[PDB]
Design a protein around this ligand. Structure first.
Ligand SMILES: NS(=O)(=O)c1cc2c(cc1Cl)N[C@H]([C@H]1C[C@H]3C=C[C@@H]1C3)NS2(=O)=O
Lengths: 130, 90, 379, 86, 197, 49
C-alpha cells in the first residue's frame, strides 16, 4: 500500500482533460506537477496553481479553505506519513517483544492512513469543479 | 409634429427594440430561459463527507482517551446537589 | 418525386423514360380526356416567371406563353402572374410553407441509468466511506479491553450493520458503548442526506423530461430563439414573410433579418443537411410536400412540425384560350371524386420512403417507468 | 447601473442543509434535547431491587432512541410503559 | 442475498416516489387517444358519420383498405351511426363521455369547438380533400374577373385574416386557452381508496 | 336547506333516471354499493346479530 502510495504521489497522470499546456489540448494531469501530453512540445510540464482566475482568496469563507488545501496538499500527504510511521511499528513488534501495546499502536496509524486518504480524494475532485 | 407622429404609431419603439435587443448578438432570454438537469456532483455534497471523516476522527479520539481513562483508573449525593443549586440558579 | 429519371433511361424513349407522381397523372389525365401526349422537359431549367428588364417569359409557363409546350403537368405553383398569361385547373394537390427540423434525440437509457442522478465519482466515495466507516466501527468497539467478549461487532458484523444503515432497513445489533455510538450516529446522518438527495434528484429527471415541450406551431417557434430558424434565399417563402400582415409572422421576418449568421441557404438539399449538422438547434422553412418527402427519406431523421403556414396549390396549366381548358379541368375533378389522387399521392410518398411514417405518435404509453428504464436492478 | 452578470454560485460545503432555515435546525436540536430528556424522566418512573431498573432507558440511551428515530434507523430499545410510548 | 435485495428496494421504491411526484407536478393533457388511423383500431371507442350525406357516400364508394374497415364497422353499431342532423351529431359526442366520435366536415368541426360549452376537441388531419368555391354562371363576364381577385385576396394574406378573425376572435374559450392552467390538489379519497379496499 | 321550502325530502335516485352519465364497471359497481348501501346495512345486520 505504501509503495503504491509513493508511486501515486510522484506520478503525473491523475486525469486526462482538455486544458492548456502553457499560456502563450489534452492534459497529462498531475497533482504537484500538472503536465501535458501529446502537444506541440510533447513532454514538458507545469506546477499546480490555485488561481487561474484572479480574485479575492478569502471571499466565501470556505473558498479560502478549499483552494489552499488542494494545491498545498496535506491530506494525501498525511496519508503518506501516517502510513509510513505505522509500518515502522510493524517492525517494532520484535523490539520490546510482547509489550502488548505495540500492535494496537500500529493499526491506529493504518486506520488514520485510510481517513487521510479518502478526504484527499474529495478535495482533489471538489476543487476540480472547472 | 412628425416625432409625435412616429412615437404614437410605435415606429420609434420598433426601431429601438430591434436595434438594441434583436440586433444584440446574445440574449437575456436565449441563454437564461433554457431548462437543463444535472446529476449531483461531488462538490455539491462534499460537506456530508467532511462531517463523516471529521466524525471518525472524533470517534477514534474519544475512544482513545477513554482507553487511557479506564486503564489508568463521582457518586456522592451532596456535592452535585450543590451543583444543582448552582446551575438552576444560573 | 414528381417526375424523375428512370434507371432504364437507355432502353426506352421519352414517355417510357420518365416516371413519378405527375407521370402517373399524365397518363391518367390523357386517359379520361383521350389525347395523344408527349413528355419533354424544358431545357432551360426554369419555373415559369417574367422579368422586368426584358419583359420576356421563361420556363414551362414561358413555353406555354411562347407556344412551344401544349400542357403543363408539373409542380407549378398557382400565382397571379401565371394566371395572367395562361390558365390553371382546380389544384390537384394542396400544400403550404412548413417547418423542417431533425427529430429530437430520443434514445433509450442504459441499464445503468438508475445510478444516473448521482455522479459516477460519488459512488466511489460512497463505497470508500462504507469501507472507511465499518472498519472504524469495528476498531472503536473492539480495541478496548473494558471484558471485551461482550460485544458482537466483528469485522464482518460491522460491515453488515453499516450496510443496513445505508439501505435504511437497519440490522439487529446496535452499538452500546459511548464512542461506538458516535460513529454510528454520523453514518446515519450520512445516509439520510445521500439517499434523500438521490430521491429528489431522481425526481428532477422524471419531471423535466415531462416539462420540455417540442414545436407544434409557429407560436411555440416564435417564443424561442436559442434554436435558430431561417428560410431559403430566393423563392416563394422568403418574399412571403416580407409582405406579411400577421403579427405572428411579422416577428419572424424581423428576427430572420436580425440574425448575424446566414439563416438563408442556397438550395433545398443543402438546407436538408444543414439541419442535420445543427442537431436540434436549427429549423428550416420550406414547402410541406417537399418537407414530407425528406422526412420519409434516409436517415429517417428530419421531421415536419406544426401545420401549413399558408395554403398554395399545384395545378395543371393550359395555354390561355387553348382547347384543353375545360376537359382537363373536367378530368382533374373526376379523379378527386373517384379518390384516385389519394392512391396517386400515397404511392410515391411512401414507396420512395423506406422510413416508417407515424412511428412517434404519442408519448402516453411511456408515461410510467418501463422495464428497461429500471431493468438493470433486476440484472 | 452597470454591474457584472452574476456568476451563478458554487453550492457551499454546508449547503446540504440549505432547504431548511437557520431557525429550524436549532429548533430541531431543541426538540431533540427536549424529547430525549422527557422519556428518560418517564422511563425512570413506574417501578411496578430492579423495579426502578426495569426498563433500559438511560439518559444516554434516551438520546440514542431519539437520535435513531430522527435518522429513521430504529434501535433495539423500545418503550414499555404507556406514557413512555406516547 | 439480504444485501442485494436491500439495494433493490432502495431503488424500486424511490423510483415509485419520484415518478408519482412527476404525475402530480406536471399534469399534462392526455395524449390523443384517437388519431386518423387509430380510431379504426378502437372498437371500444365508437365513431360515426352522417345519415344522408355525401361524406357517407365517400365510405361506400371507397376502395381504400383502412376506409374499407370504416365502412365495414359503421354497419355494425346498434344504434346506428347515422344521425340525421348534425346537431344530434354534435350532441351525441357530448353526452357519450368520450366513447363516441363523429366524423364530419372540418369547418363545422372547428366552429362547434370554438363555442360553448367548450366541450370538444378536433384531432387529426382531414381524410379527403375538397374545397368551397365561388359559383358563377357559365359565360358570365364576372367569372374570370372574379377568381383573379380570389387569388389576389389569398396572395396578400387577406383570406387568412378574414378567417382568422372570424373563427378565432369571434370565437371563445377553445382548447388553446387550457394549457397553462396548472393546479395541484390534495389527493382525494377516491384516488387511494384502492389502498383502503 | 336555506330556502323557504325547507323540510321537503326526496327519495334519492343515486344513479339518476335522466342524466348524462354512463358509469364504468369500476363505478357502476361502486354506485350500486353507494345506492344500495349494503355496507351500512351490513353494519345493521352485524350489530344486531
Ligand atoms: N391528398 S391531396 O393533397 O393529394 C389532394 C388534394 C386536392 C384534391 C384531392 C387530393 Cl387527393 N382535390 C381538390 C379538388 C376538389 C375541389 C376543391 C379543389 C379541387 C376541386 N384539390 S386539392 O385540395 O388540391
Amino acid at each position: 500500500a505504501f509503495s503504491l502510495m509513493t508511486i501515486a504521489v510522484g506520478t503525473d497522470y491523475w486525469l486526462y482533460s482538455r486544458g492548456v499546456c502553457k499560456t502563450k489540448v489534452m492534459t497529462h494531469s498531475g497533482l504537484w506537477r500538472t503536465c501535458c501530453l501529446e502537444g506541440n512540445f510533447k513532454g514538458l510540464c507545469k506546477q499546480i496553481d490555485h488561481f487561474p482566475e484572479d480574485a479575492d482568496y478569502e471571499a466565501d469563507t470556505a473558498e479560502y479553505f478549499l483552494r489552499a488545501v488542494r494545491a498545498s496538499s496535506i491530506f494525501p500527504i498525511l496519508s503518506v506519513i501516517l502510513l509510513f510511521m505505522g509500518g515502522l511499528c510493524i517492525a517494532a513488534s520484535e523490539f520490546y517483544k510482547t509489550r502488548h501495546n505495540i500492535i494496537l499502536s500500529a493499526g491506529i496509524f493504518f486506520v488514520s492512513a485510510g481517513l487521510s486518504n479518502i478526504i484527499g480524494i474529495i478535495v482533489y475532485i471538489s476543487a476540480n469543479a472547472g | 409634429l412628425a416625432v409625435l407622429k412616429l412615437s404614437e404609431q410605435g415606429v420609434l419603439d420598433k426601431l429601438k427594440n430591434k436595434w438594441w435587443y434583436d440586433k444584440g448578438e446574445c440574449g437575456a432570454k436565449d441563454s437564461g430561459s433554457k431548462e437543463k438537469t444535472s446529476a449531483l456532483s461531488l462538490s455539491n455534497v462534499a460537506g456530508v463527507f467532511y462531517i463523516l471523516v471529521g466524525g471518525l476522527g472524533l470517534a477514534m479520539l474519544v475512544a482513545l482517551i477513554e482507553f487511557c481513562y479506564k486503564s489508568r483508573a463521582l457518586f456522592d449525593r451532596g456535592v452535585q446537589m450543590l451543583l444543582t443549586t448552582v446551575g438552576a440558579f444560573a | 418525386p414528381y417526375v424523375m429519371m428512370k434507371k432504364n433511361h437507355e432502353m426506352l424513349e421519352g414517355n417510357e423514360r420518365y416516371e413519378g407522381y405527375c407521370v402517373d397523372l399524365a397518363a391518367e389525365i390523357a386517359k379520361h380526356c383521350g389525347f395523344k401526349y408527349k413528355l419533354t422537359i424544358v431545357g432551360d431549367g426554369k419555373y415559369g416567371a417574367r422579368d422586368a428588364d426584358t419583359k420576356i417569359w421563361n420556363g414551362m409557363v414561358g413555353e406555354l406563353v411562347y407556344g412551344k409546350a401544349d400542357i403543363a403537368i408539373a409542380p407549378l405553383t398557382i400565382t397571379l402572374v401565371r394566371e395572367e398569361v395562361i390558365d390553371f385547373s382546380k389544384p390537384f394537390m394542396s400544400l403550404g410553407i412548413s417547418i423542417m427540423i431533425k427529430k429530437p434525440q430520443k434514445s433509450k437509457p442504459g441499464v445503468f441509468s438508475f445510478l444516473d442522478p448521482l455522479a459516477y465519482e460519488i459512488w466511489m466515495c460512497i463505497v470508500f466511506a462504507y469501507i472507511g466507516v465499518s472498519v472504524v466501527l469495528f476498531l472503536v468497539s473492539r480495541f478496548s479491553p473494558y471484558s471485551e467478549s461482550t460485544n458482537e461487532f466483528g469485522i464482518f458484523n460491522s460491515l453488515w450493520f453499516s450496510l443496513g444503515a445505508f439501505m435504511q432497513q437497519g440490522c439487529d445489533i446496535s452499538p452500546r458503548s459511548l464512542s461506538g455510538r458516535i460513529v454510528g450516529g454520523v453514518w446515519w446522518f450520512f445516509t439520510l442526506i445521500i439517499i434523500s438527495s438521490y430521491t429528489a434528484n431522481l425526481a428532477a429527471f422524471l419531471t423535466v423530461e415531462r416539462m420540455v415541450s417540442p414545436i407544434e406551431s409557429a407560436e411555440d417557434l416564435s417564443k424561442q430563439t436559442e434554436i435558430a430558424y431561417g428560410t431559403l434565399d430566393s423563392g416563394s417563402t422568403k418574399e412571403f414573410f416580407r409582405r406579411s400582415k400577421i403579427a405572428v409572422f411579422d416577428k419572424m421576418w424581423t428576427y430572420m433579418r436580425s440574425a448575424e449568421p446566414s439563416v438563408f441557404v442556397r438550395t433545398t438539399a443543402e438546407g436538408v443537411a444543414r439541419v442535420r449538422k445543427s442537431k436540434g438547434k436549427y429549423a428550416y422553412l420550406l414547402e410541406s410536400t417537399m418537407n414530407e418527402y425528406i422526412e420519409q427519406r434516409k436517415p429517417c431523421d428530419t421531421m415536419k412540425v406544426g401545420g401549413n403556414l399558408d395554403s398554395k396549390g399545384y395545378g395543371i396549366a393550359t395555354p390561355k384560350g387553348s382547347s384543353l381548358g375545360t376537359p382537363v379541368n373536367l378530368a382533374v375533378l373526376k379523379l378527386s371524386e373517384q379518390g384516385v389522387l389519394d392512391k396517386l399521392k400515397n404511392k410515391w410518398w411512401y414507396d420512395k420512403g423506406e422510413c416508417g411514417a407515424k412511428d412517434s405518435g404519442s408519448k402516453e404509453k411511456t408515461s410510467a417507468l418501463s422495464l428497461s428504464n429500471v431493468a438493470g436492478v433486476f440484472y | 447601473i452597470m454591474i457584472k452578470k452574476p456568476q451563478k454560485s458554487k453550492p457551499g460545503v454546508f449547503s446540504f442543509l440549505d432547504p431548511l432555515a437557520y431557525e429550524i435546525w436549532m429548533c430541531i436540536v431543541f426538540a431533540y434535547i427536549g424529547v430525549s430528556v422527557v422519556l428518560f424522566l418517564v422511563s425512570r418512573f413506574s417501578p411496578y431491587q430492579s423495579s426502578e431498573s426495569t426498563n433500559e432507558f438511560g439518559i444516554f440511551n434516551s438520546l440514542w432512541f431519539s437520535l435513531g428515530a430522527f435518522m429513521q434507523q430504529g434501535c433495539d430499545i423500545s418503550p414499555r410503559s404507556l406514557s413512555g410510548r406516547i
